[PDB]
Every structure is written in C-alpha cells, then in structure tokens.
Design an enzyme around this catalytic site. Structure first.
Site, PDB file in Angstrom:
ATOM      1  N   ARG A   1     -44.486 -10.078   3.022  1.00  0.00           N
ATOM      2  CA  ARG A   1     -43.818  -9.019   2.418  1.00  0.00           C
ATOM      3  C   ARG A   1     -42.800  -8.037   3.170  1.00  0.00           C
ATOM      4  NH1 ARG A   1     -47.971  -5.727  -1.550  1.00  0.00           N
ATOM      5  NH2 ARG A   1     -47.247  -7.576  -2.833  1.00  0.00           N
TER       6      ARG A   1
ATOM      7  N   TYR B   1     -57.321  -6.014 -11.215  1.00  0.00           N
ATOM      8  CA  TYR B   1     -56.339  -6.798 -12.046  1.00  0.00           C
ATOM      9  C   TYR B   1     -57.100  -7.822 -12.625  1.00  0.00           C
ATOM     10  CZ  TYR B   1     -53.276  -4.410  -8.841  1.00  0.00           C
ATOM     11  OH  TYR B   1     -52.461  -3.478  -7.871  1.00  0.00           O
TER      12      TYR B   1
ATOM     13  N   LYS C   1      -9.410  -9.227   5.413  1.00  0.00           N
ATOM     14  CA  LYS C   1     -10.928  -8.762   5.189  1.00  0.00           C
ATOM     15  C   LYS C   1     -11.114  -7.366   5.318  1.00  0.00           C
ATOM     16  CE  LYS C   1     -15.174  -9.061   3.058  1.00  0.00           C
ATOM     17  NZ  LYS C   1     -16.054  -9.659   3.760  1.00  0.00           N
TER      18      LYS C   1
ATOM     19  N   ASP D   1     -56.495  14.500 -18.395  1.00  0.00           N
ATOM     20  CA  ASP D   1     -56.491  12.952 -18.045  1.00  0.00           C
ATOM     21  C   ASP D   1     -55.306  12.401 -18.906  1.00  0.00           C
ATOM     22  OD1 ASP D   1     -56.837  10.102 -18.159  1.00  0.00           O
ATOM     23  OD2 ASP D   1     -59.261  10.443 -17.605  1.00  0.00           O
TER      24      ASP D   1
ATOM     25  N   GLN E   1     -54.369 -14.826   6.835  1.00  0.00           N
ATOM     26  CA  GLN E   1     -52.901 -14.963   7.847  1.00  0.00           C
ATOM     27  C   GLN E   1     -51.677 -14.508   6.969  1.00  0.00           C
ATOM     28  OE1 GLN E   1     -52.998 -16.644  10.848  1.00  0.00           O
ATOM     29  NE2 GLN E   1     -51.155 -15.557  10.837  1.00  0.00           N
TER      30      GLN E   1
ATOM     31  N   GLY F   1     -58.307 -17.109   4.544  1.00  0.00           N
ATOM     32  CA  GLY F   1     -57.653 -17.462   5.832  1.00  0.00           C
ATOM     33  C   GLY F   1     -57.474 -16.127   6.323  1.00  0.00           C
TER      34      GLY F   1
ATOM     35  N   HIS G   1       0.818  -1.402   0.072  1.00  0.00           N
ATOM     36  CA  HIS G   1       0.013   0.005   0.173  1.00  0.00           C
ATOM     37  C   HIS G   1       0.876   1.125  -0.052  1.00  0.00           C
ATOM     38  CE1 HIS G   1      -3.454   2.701   1.548  1.00  0.00           C
ATOM     39  NE2 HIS G   1      -4.041   2.145   0.483  1.00  0.00           N
TER      40      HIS G   1
ATOM     41  N   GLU H   1     -45.202  -5.150  -5.474  1.00  0.00           N
ATOM     42  CA  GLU H   1     -45.742  -6.050  -6.072  1.00  0.00           C
ATOM     43  C   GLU H   1     -45.057  -6.618  -7.586  1.00  0.00           C
ATOM     44  OE1 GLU H   1     -49.934  -6.237  -6.363  1.00  0.00           O
ATOM     45  OE2 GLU H   1     -50.212  -7.625  -8.080  1.00  0.00           O
TER      46      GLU H   1
ATOM     47  N   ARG I   1     -47.918  -8.779   5.772  1.00  0.00           N
ATOM     48  CA  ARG I   1     -47.364  -7.326   5.123  1.00  0.00           C
ATOM     49  C   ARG I   1     -46.757  -6.224   5.941  1.00  0.00           C
ATOM     50  NH1 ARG I   1     -48.562  -9.539   0.460  1.00  0.00           N
ATOM     51  NH2 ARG I   1     -50.894  -9.929  -0.174  1.00  0.00           N
TER      52      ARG I   1
ATOM     53  N   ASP J   1     -55.025  16.766 -12.998  1.00  0.00           N
ATOM     54  CA  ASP J   1     -56.021  15.587 -12.729  1.00  0.00           C
ATOM     55  C   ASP J   1     -57.328  15.897 -13.326  1.00  0.00           C
ATOM     56  OD1 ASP J   1     -57.111  13.441 -11.316  1.00  0.00           O
ATOM     57  OD2 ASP J   1     -55.828  13.612  -9.804  1.00  0.00           O
TER      58      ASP J   1
HETATM   59  O1  LIG Z   1     -48.346  -0.780  -1.860  1.00  0.00           O
HETATM   60  C1  LIG Z   1     -48.127  -1.965  -1.902  1.00  0.00           C
HETATM   61  O2  LIG Z   1     -47.184  -2.876  -1.330  1.00  0.00           O
HETATM   62  C2  LIG Z   1     -48.918  -2.552  -2.934  1.00  0.00           C
HETATM   63  O3  LIG Z   1     -49.998  -3.447  -2.498  1.00  0.00           O
HETATM   64  C3  LIG Z   1     -51.163  -3.882  -3.017  1.00  0.00           C
HETATM   65  O4  LIG Z   1     -51.155  -4.944  -3.220  1.00  0.00           O
HETATM   66  P1  LIG Z   1     -51.994  -5.942  -1.940  1.00  0.00           P
HETATM   67  O5  LIG Z   1     -51.375  -5.671  -0.557  1.00  0.00           O
HETATM   68  O6  LIG Z   1     -52.096  -7.180  -2.230  1.00  0.00           O
HETATM   69  O7  LIG Z   1     -53.577  -5.174  -1.874  1.00  0.00           O
HETATM   70  P2  LIG Z   1     -54.049  -4.733  -0.477  1.00  0.00           P
HETATM   71  O8  LIG Z   1     -55.336  -3.961  -0.927  1.00  0.00           O
HETATM   72  O9  LIG Z   1     -53.206  -3.881   0.358  1.00  0.00           O
HETATM   73  O10 LIG Z   1     -54.553  -6.037   0.106  1.00  0.00           O
HETATM   74  C4  LIG Z   1     -53.772  -6.919   1.102  1.00  0.00           C
HETATM   75  C5  LIG Z   1     -54.531  -8.229   1.387  1.00  0.00           C
HETATM   76  O11 LIG Z   1     -55.319  -8.040   2.233  1.00  0.00           O
HETATM   77  C6  LIG Z   1     -56.284  -8.906   2.298  1.00  0.00           C
HETATM   78  N1  LIG Z   1     -57.737  -8.482   2.460  1.00  0.00           N
HETATM   79  C7  LIG Z   1     -58.043  -7.281   1.490  1.00  0.00           C
HETATM   80  C8  LIG Z   1     -59.262  -6.825   1.781  1.00  0.00           C
HETATM   81  C9  LIG Z   1     -60.251  -7.384   2.336  1.00  0.00           C
HETATM   82  O12 LIG Z   1     -61.479  -7.199   2.567  1.00  0.00           O
HETATM   83  N2  LIG Z   1     -59.875  -8.645   3.101  1.00  0.00           N
HETATM   84  C10 LIG Z   1     -58.690  -9.182   3.002  1.00  0.00           C
HETATM   85  O13 LIG Z   1     -58.500 -10.173   3.542  1.00  0.00           O
HETATM   86  C11 LIG Z   1     -55.920  -9.418   1.006  1.00  0.00           C
HETATM   87  O14 LIG Z   1     -55.424 -10.802   1.211  1.00  0.00           O
HETATM   88  C12 LIG Z   1     -55.161  -8.695   0.311  1.00  0.00           C
HETATM   89  O15 LIG Z   1     -54.179  -9.405  -0.564  1.00  0.00           O
HETATM   90  C13 LIG Z   1     -51.230  -3.251  -4.428  1.00  0.00           C
HETATM   91  O16 LIG Z   1     -51.352  -4.474  -5.404  1.00  0.00           O
HETATM   92  C14 LIG Z   1     -50.122  -2.031  -4.967  1.00  0.00           C
HETATM   93  O17 LIG Z   1     -50.640  -1.648  -5.896  1.00  0.00           O
HETATM   94  C15 LIG Z   1     -49.619  -1.645  -3.853  1.00  0.00           C
HETATM   95  O18 LIG Z   1     -48.516  -0.719  -4.422  1.00  0.00           O
END
Ligand SMILES: O=C(O)[C@H]1O[C@H](OP(=O)(O)OP(=O)(O)OC[C@H]2O[C@@H](n3ccc(=O)[nH]c3=O)[C@H](O)[C@@H]2O)[C@H](O)[C@@H](O)[C@@H]1O
Ligand SMILES: O=C(O)[C@H]1O[C@H](OP(=O)(O)OP(=O)(O)OC[C@H]2O[C@@H](n3ccc(=O)[nH]c3=O)[C@H](O)[C@@H]2O)[C@H](O)[C@@H](O)[C@@H]1O
Lengths: 638, 215, 101, 110
Positions: free
Chosen positions: A602, A381, A129, A351, A515, A513, A96, A417, A518, A330
């Site tokens: 998540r 979707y 290291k 728009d 369960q 479920g 060095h 997602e 996120r 918007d």
């Molecule tokens: O911001 C994020 O990370 C992303 O999350 C969302 O995806 P997701 O989390 O699956 O949509 P949510 O509306 O947050 O739903 C979460 C989960 O809650 C559950 N859920 C939702 C609504 C309900 O009435 N009951 C219920 O059990 C479902 O399993 C659903 O997948 C969106 O797809 C994306 O646009 C967004 O960017």
C-alpha cells in the site's frame, strides 16, 4: 511539399493562406469547433478535421499515414505530443504570439498590454517538449503605440504574421534550419487569464490601470470594479496625470468621469453598469449614481461522529483556528470531553441510523459536512457485512443527498481500500485501477461500498452541482484510535490491537505471515491535510479526489510490531505490564474468519495533496508509535 | 484472467473519474449484499452472469437511434437506415457472444435447480466458442445482410468508420478489451454447454429486426 | 440555402437520422436521373430535385466543423442513397360531466 | 413579541428558529426557551411543542415582493403548505392560533 497545419482563429486563418501561397501542398488542416479556419479550408476544397485530442491512435496513426513533410502550428489551443511532432521529417514549427523567448506562456497578446510593453512580434520556432521554447526561425517584431488596444494590436500582430510567412516560409521549402536556441533565463511563461484578473486596483499608477483597460478592451472581458456592490466595466480610458488631491478610488468629476489612483487619475470614456448597454462616461456615472465617493460570520462545519478517530482530532484543529463554529453529532461524548464547554463548539446528540430529521436540519444550519461515521474494521466486513453496508453506505448516502439538496459542501471520507489489491507502484486517485476479489470474499464489502458511494458523489457533483472533495486516508494512527476495551473484540485497527496484546500479555498475532507492507501516516499530518482541504484555498479542492498519506513510512506489520516492541520496553511503565507473550503467525481465516482477503502492499500518490494543499507529511513512524503507545498505556488503571 | 472464474477471478475497474463503471460497481455491491444475506440470513439465491447474449428482441430499433442499444442491434440499425457502422476505438476488442437459446436454456436449468446444485453458487452463462471482435462481428453482420432475401429493399451500405470513445460515449468512458466466460459452474451445475454458433445468432437476429420494419 | 447561409441557422436535412446542414450550394440543372432526394456522387456531392439537382459546395454534419461537400459526404459516408403508437390520454374523473363526452 | 411577552408577568415563551443572531439579549432569560427548528423539516419537534403550549404564532413566512416572482414555489410551499401543517397541529391538539394574515390579502382593493 506536404504540410499538416494545426490552425485556429485569426492567426490560423492567415497562416493557412500563407502556407498555401508559399507553394506547399496542403493535405490536412486540423482545428477546433466554433474569421474562421473551418470555413476557410472548406471553401478552399481542403480536407479539414477537428478532433477532440489529436494525440489519439485513430489520429496519430492516421496523420503519418498522410506522409507529412512539415507540420505548422498557427495558434493551436491543444498541446501536441512528441509522438505526433516526429511524424514529419522536416519537423513542426509553432508560430507564437510573443517576441520569444519572452512571454512564452499562453494568451500573451493581453499580457503585453497589462505590463506596458513597448514592442512585441511574431516568433516562429521549433516545437520541442518544452513549452514554446524551441529555436527561433523568424521574428517580425511590432511596436506597441501609446494608444494601441487589444483588437488593434491583434490585427497589427496578425498583419505581422501574415507578412513574415511570405518570406521565411518559401525558403523553408528546401530543408534549411537557420535556427537559434533560447537563453533559458530570458523566459516568462505567463499563464491563462481568469476572469478574477480583469479587476481594477486603483492604488497603482494610472498607467497601470490604463494598461489593464486597454489589455481587455472589447471584445475582451474589460477592466472592472464595484461601486458599492454594482460590477461595472470600463471599455476605454485616458491616462490623466492630474492627481487632483484625492485618495485612490475617489471620484473626482462625473463629466469627465475621473477616478483618482496612486498618482494622477483615470478618465473613464465608456463602460457599462452591469450587463446593460455600453454607455458614455458621463451616462456611465449617471446609471451608477456617482457623485464623489470612493470605489470598492464564521464558517459552520458539521461533523457527524465528532467523538471518534478523525472527529476528535479534527474538532481540535478546527477549534484552535479562531473563525470556526464546529457542530459535532454523536451518540456519546466519552472522548471529546475537553472541548464540550468550548464556546466555538456545540455538541449535539444523534445517530445517523435513527435520526433522519435532525441530520437534515443541521446540514442546513452548517456550511461543510464531514460524515465521519463509518464502521471500518477488517473483521466486521466478514462478521457483519450487512451492518457494514447499511451504515457505511446507505445511511451516509442519505446524508449526502441532504447536502446536494441544500447546496452544501461535502468533505467526504473515502478510503485507501477503495483501490483494493492495486498493482500500481503508488496508488493514484485519478489513474490507479481498483482490484477486488470475487463475491465469495466479503472483505471487500467495505471497499466496494465506499467506492460506489464515491461514484454517486461524483455523479451528483457533476450532473447536479454538488460541491464535494474526497479524501482517502492511508492508515492514520495516533491517540484515540478505537478503545482497548473494544479492541478485545477484534473491532480494532492494526496498531492498537498489537498494543492490546502487549498490555494483557497475549501473543501478537501476525496474520498470514505478517509480511504485508503499508504506509503509516501520523495523525498530525493527516489532520493538517484535512484542514488544508477544508479551508479550500482558492477552490483547489472542489471536484478533486485528494489523497492523504505518508509514503515515507512504508513498513510491515512485523516491522511495525518490532518498532512497537522497542518503544514498549523503553516506556516508564513496561514494569507495570506482564512480560512479552511473543509473536505467532496464524491463518487469516483463524482471526478474521471465512471469506477474508488482504492487500499486500500500500503506497499513496500524495501528488494531489502536494499540488492542492502545499502539504507533505512530516512526522515519521517512530514518533507515532511512541505517542500512540504512551496515550493508550497511561489510559489504564495504574 | 484468460477465462473469468466467478469464484476466483478478480474484479478490476477504472478510477472514480470513469463513470462507465457506475454500472459494474453497482451490480457487484448488490451481488455482494445478496451473498451476505444468503449466509447471514439464509437467502435462497443463485447469481447468473450473462455474457453478451443476443438474438431476436434485443432492444428496439427506435431506442437504438438514441444510443440506448447494445452493439449488435445498433449495427443492425446502421445497416437499416444507410448509416455508417462505427467501430469505436478501432472496434478491435473481443467478446464471447452467447446465443439467446443457449443462454435461456442455461437460465432455465438454473430455475429448475436440479438437486439444489445452484444454491449459493454464482453461475456464469456464456459461449467461449464464439469469441469475435466488433470488426469481425460487423463483417459477419454485413455478410448475412446481403444474402438476405430483403437485401434489396434497404439502402446501400454506408461504410465503416473508426471513432474515438469520447465521441460516441462521451466524457469518462472506458472499455473491457477481452471477455471470455468460465462456463464450468454452468456445465457442472446445469449439465449445460453452448451449442448454437455465432452465424445462426447473427442471421436470426438480423432476420427478425429486418422484417420487423414496415415495408 | 442562400437565404439562411452563415451566420444564419442554415438549411439542413437528415442522413437517415443525423442532422447535417448545407452552407453553400450550386443549383445544378443537369437533371441527372435519380429520385428527387437521391445522392448522385461524392465529389462533387449532388442530390436530385424535381428539375435537376443541388450541388453541395460546403457544409457540416452535426456540429463538427464545416468542410467541403466531399468531406461532408464522407463523415456521413454516402453513396447513391436517399435523404431520409397512439397517444395515451389519462382522464381522472372519466365517469362524469366532461369525461363521458 | 418575545421581549413584550417576556417583560409581562406570567409568560413562558418557547421560540423556534434556526438561529439566535437577533434574540441574543434574552436567550438565557428564565421565562424564555429557545428551540432549534425549521418548519420545513421538523414534524415532531414542532408538533410536540404545539401540544406543550397554549397559543401558537406561526410567524415563519417569506414576505418579500421580489421573492414572489423570483421563487414562487418556495414562497407557496413555505407561506402556505408548511404553515398549514402547523395549523392542523393546532386543530388536533386544540390550541389557539394567533395567526398572521397579511395586508396583501386585499391586493388591489378599491
Ligand atoms: O486507513 C486505511 O488505509 C484503511 O485501512 C484499513 O485496512 P487494513 O489496513 O487492512 O486494516 P488494519 O487494521 O490496519 O490491518 C492491517 C493488517 O495488519 C495485519 N494484522 C492486523 C491485526 C493483527 O492483530 N495482526 C495482523 O497481522 C493484517 O494483515 C491486517 O490486514 C481499513 O480497512 C480502512 O478502514 C482504513 O481506512
Ligand atoms: O450484455 C453484456 O455482456 C454486457 O453488455 C454491455 O457491455 P458491452 O458488451 O461492452 O457493450 P455493448 O453495447 O454490448 O458493445 C460492446 C462494445 O462494442 C463497441 N461498439 C459499440 C457500438 C458500435 O456501434 N460499435 C462498437 O464498436 C463498444 O466499445 C462497446 O463497448 C453492458 O455494459 C453489460 O452490462 C452487459 O452485461
């Protein structure tokens, strides 16, 4: 003995002959492309390779195949991986430049001149290291004279290495380790010099400025400053203590050229006014036209979808900062009513599905573009996959081509997602893979869409010079997240759907479920991180795929509704609403319809967000549910 | 997944800083848009996913020198112009190689669409009985080269040499290690299974490209 | 080879289709019998001319670093071998003053 | 020209440009109407206004001697192509162009 040498430039040029003189057998010299090490080893009949990364199964498993005894690193630019160090029994030793354990950084031969060091010399040590923090084996120190410059001290320290490797190197052939560790407080790891560092600061001692000029004297970039707007360099100078009562930066004489500093004056011997030839100090002040003087609009943010989830809170944050002109487009202002009249904000009707001219005009008028228009509800979707693809991909992509054409910056909103059903512990923007179900699972028409759009941004910003930064929100929520009257359709995110079930006394459905888990990020944390990206302090965001999210809030939708329910009962308006209608688990193809699939867990890697913004989330889950609840609750006929 | 099922197997690609998948993601989103039309508008469609088909007329020797060439005909070029057969990143990854005749037969059966069995379904055309490695391919290639009646007119074999990925493909590349098709939907809908084995494919591909050169 | 040796562009030829340069050489009169342009061996790397052969001391294949003539013929992978459509004209206004001629 | 016509009695001036950083004094003058526009992008807003007005003065042009050799194509595409589009707007809707020619048209005249 068998030696593998990683050598480059003058140091490697001399060190290879030093190892060859010490009696070693050389069977491999590795370097880089383009005194040279490549032509040196070539004319010595040595085999010499130049790989991109030596840490590679084709190279690692073919370096040890040569049976190395010692490995020597003579100014190697790439870093060696521990798996490649442990290939030689006696070990690997890097020479060095600095007098270790000082200036253990990179390119220290400049920094010693910068600070004004008195001495520095070669230090061969054992590669560990830690960055150049092994054990000293030899140190032929060299003194820095009062006149020494970059090239001179280079050849001087180069002679020091060529001289040290003629003594300790013949002794190392027998297998001895006369080594000494380093006091891990007596360390300095000065990093690489960027061109915005050879800039002169005249308000410092002339010694400091002279030290800088010497540190980058030819063939280095050279110190520089600006007369008016003309960048001119200073190749050589003289520390003239004559203060000659003048303010720092003021020109004193034009022949000899003398500029006043905090103490004394710097005398410019040579230099160039621009990229024209190097000239004499007097001729330098002539082409600059110097006599006896001194030396050395707000930002337009275009928001597509100002009246929306992010757009509302982003316009508020950008607006509170004084120096921001936000233009928000918007179809309606039914939620940005609070700053419509605000002078630093202009609403504009549009728009992106219809307008193709006004969009382009405004993209020209602005500085950064945030196409926040996108339909992002899991039900849509499968319901309207073509509508989702045409709006979230096609039209927004046309906005981005506007930007690449007019040379604007895109703070584009990718999504979480995009990872899909990713297995990784925490979803990493730059490493985590992207998993999605088959074509007969149209829930991913959104994910695949935002990703291909991501990749096209990548391609433009790489093959055409688009300034961009991608941010992937992780379940942001707070006030103004869809509307309860539009949540009755299913076109709503998870939180405000369950809040609706509490308002109208509908069972809180827990899909499949309920369960799955996120990470839930508060609106204030996400809007702060986005603003930090928009400010883009020191280009830390350009070309980067940052990740906004709160890993401190991983919960399940059952856990979410539990925390939600406890804050509902504690609200001063629980009485105004019907009694709780209970939970009930349901099939996915009962609420989202045919062709649904879901991610179970998540978790975001906020590494880049930490590293680039100096930001980590704060507001925890509980506060978000309360504020989200409160807002939506009192926004009801009461 | 061991064998890729069009109706069950997932779809995995590297992160954005891997522009190799700009192709895969593109063809997939397009796949999904077709699917959407076929159900939200009634588009009559059938999707067929070839699996490393090869045979005569697969790229050109003149377009192979740029890189715009699939693996088989690129190596055939290497054996044609005294150029080493590079085995990128060891050349040890495996794929199922389908003969041109079998793949075309399966596609023809798709076009016929006997009894609408192909509507809305994602057919997959491949030969799982021909799994090989680029190393093993190149050797079977070479083996067919020297027993060819024109072994003599072409220069000596220039050797094999392993090469980094980002030395032949460049920045941002990644690769799929194994690839095997679930030919069920093909069998089920087409009454079709592959037949021609790899050696015939290797030998006919070489033979055509070889005599397709001025002497 | 000497006339344009370093730091000049350097002589070069084609290994089929890859561009390799010859930085230093030794004109080798032992006219070892091959076609002018044929490789004679690897170490030393020799290639035949009309009156003898050229001997490759050093060189580089492509732009990767300069090496020994032996390493050059390996990165290239050499044994005794040899070194090394019509034009579409669109005429808008073909039926007219210039075009017909 | 905006201030002159604005001081005069019966002049309703409509001014198109991308900014208002020099016309700030009379922006809210009741006989002056500012409209957002770039003659390179807008086709409809410019054509609309040409119909609504009586005389057209296409003062948009790049007139810098350095830009001719620097950006020759954008100089042509703006000073010529886009301005000519506006002039065909005028012949179609039967309006008068007080068009700005240039001294450089004589060039190296003797
Ligand atoms: O911001 C994020 O990370 C992303 O999350 C969302 O995806 P997701 O989390 O699956 O949509 P949510 O509306 O947050 O739903 C979460 C989960 O809650 C559950 N859920 C939702 C609504 C309900 O009435 N009951 C219920 O059990 C479902 O399993 C659903 O997948 C969106 O797809 C994306 O646009 C967004 O960017
Ligand atoms: O036809 C197919 O199945 C697919 O072929 C390609 O994918 P791939 O087979 O992986 O690419 P090839 O050029 O055909 O080569 C296969 C692999 O062999 C390796 N290879 C290539 C060239 C070579 O000289 N040596 C070598 O080892 C490369 O890693 C390469 O990825 C295309 O990417 C797909 O679109 C196409 O569907």
């Amino acid at each position: 003995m068998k030696a593998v040498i990683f050598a480059y430039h003058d140091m490697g040029c001399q060190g290879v002959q030093a190892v060859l003189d010490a009696g070693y057998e050389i069977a491999a010299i590795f370097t880089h492309a383009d005194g040279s090490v490549s032509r040196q080893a070539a004319e010595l009949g040595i085999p010499v390779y130049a790989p991109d990364n030596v840490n590679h199964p084709i190279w690692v498993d073919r370096i040890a195949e040569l049976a190395p005894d010692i490995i020597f690193s003579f100014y190697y630019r790439n870093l060696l991986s521990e798996e490649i160090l442990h290939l030689a029994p006696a070990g690997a030793f890097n020479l060095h430049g600095s007098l270790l354990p000082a200036y253990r950084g990179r390119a220290p031969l400049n920094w010693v001149l910068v600070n004004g060091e008195s001495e520095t010399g070669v230090t061969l040590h054992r590669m560990v290291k830690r960055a150049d923090a092994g054990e000293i084996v030899a140190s032929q120190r060299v003194a820095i004279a009062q006149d020494d410059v970059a090239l001179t001290l280079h050849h001087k320290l180069c002679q020091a290495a060529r001289q040290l490797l003629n003594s300790i190197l013949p002794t190392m052939k027998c297998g001895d380790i006369p080594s000494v560790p380093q006091r891990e407080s007596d360390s300095t790891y000065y990093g690489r010099r960027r061109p915005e560092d050879g800039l002169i600061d005249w308000h410092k001692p002339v010694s400091t400025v002279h030290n800088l000029v010497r540190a980058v004297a030819a063939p280095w970039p050279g110190a520089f400053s600006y007369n008016g707007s003309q960048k001119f360099t200073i190749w050589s100078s003289r520390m003239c203590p004559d203060a000659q009562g003048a303010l720092p930066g003021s020109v004193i004489s034009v022949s000899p050229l003398r500029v006043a500093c905090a103490d004394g004056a710097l005398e410019i011997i040579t230099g160039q006014a621009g990229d024209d030839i190097t000239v004499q100090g007097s001729q330098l002040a002539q082409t600059l036209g110097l006599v006896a003087g001194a030396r050395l609009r707000r930002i337009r943010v275009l928001i597509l979808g100002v009246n929306g989830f992010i757009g509302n809170h982003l316009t508020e944050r950008l607006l509170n900062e004084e120096n921001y002109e936000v233009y928000g487009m918007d179809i309606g202002s039914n939620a940005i009513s609070r700053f419509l009249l605000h002078p630093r904000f202009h609403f504009v009707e549009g728009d992106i599905s219809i307008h193709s001219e006004w969009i382009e005009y405004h993209v020209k008028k602005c500085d950064v573009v945030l196409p926040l228009v996108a339909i992002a509800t899991p039900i849509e979707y499968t319901r309207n996959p073509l509508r989702v693809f045409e709006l979230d991909f096609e039209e927004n992509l046309r906005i981005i081509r506007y930007c690449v054409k007019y040379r604007k910056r895109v703070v584009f909103p990718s999504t979480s997602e995009v990872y899909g059903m990713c297995t990784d512990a925490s979803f990493d923007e730059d490493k985590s893979n992207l998993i999605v179900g088959p074509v007969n699972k149209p829930r991913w028409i959104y994910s695949v869409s935002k990703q291909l759009l991501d990749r096209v941004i990548w391609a433009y910003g790489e093959k055409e010079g688009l300034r961009f930064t991608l941010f992937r929100p992780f379940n942001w929520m707070g006030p103004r997240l869809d509307s309860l009257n539009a949540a009755r359709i299913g076109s709503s995110r998870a939180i405000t759907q369950l809040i609706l079930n509490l308002v109208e006394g509908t069972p809180i459905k827990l899909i499949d479920g309920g369960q799955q888990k996120r990470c839930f990020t508060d609106i204030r944390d996400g809007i702060e991180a986005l603003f930090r990206i928009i400010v883009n302090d020191g280009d830390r965001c350009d070309g980067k795929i940052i990740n906004i999210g709160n890993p401190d809030n991983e919960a399940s939708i059952q856990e979410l509704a539990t925390l939600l329910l406890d804050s509902f009962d504690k609200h001063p308006l629980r009485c105004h609403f019907p009694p709780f209608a209970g939970f009930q688990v349901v099939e996915s193809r009962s609420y989202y319809g045919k062709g649904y699939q879901d991610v179970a867990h998540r978790k975001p890697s906020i590494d880049n967000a930490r590293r680039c913004l100096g930001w980590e989330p704060s507001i925890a889950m509980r506060d978000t549910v309360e504020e989200t609840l409160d807002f939506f609750l009192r926004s009801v006929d009461i």
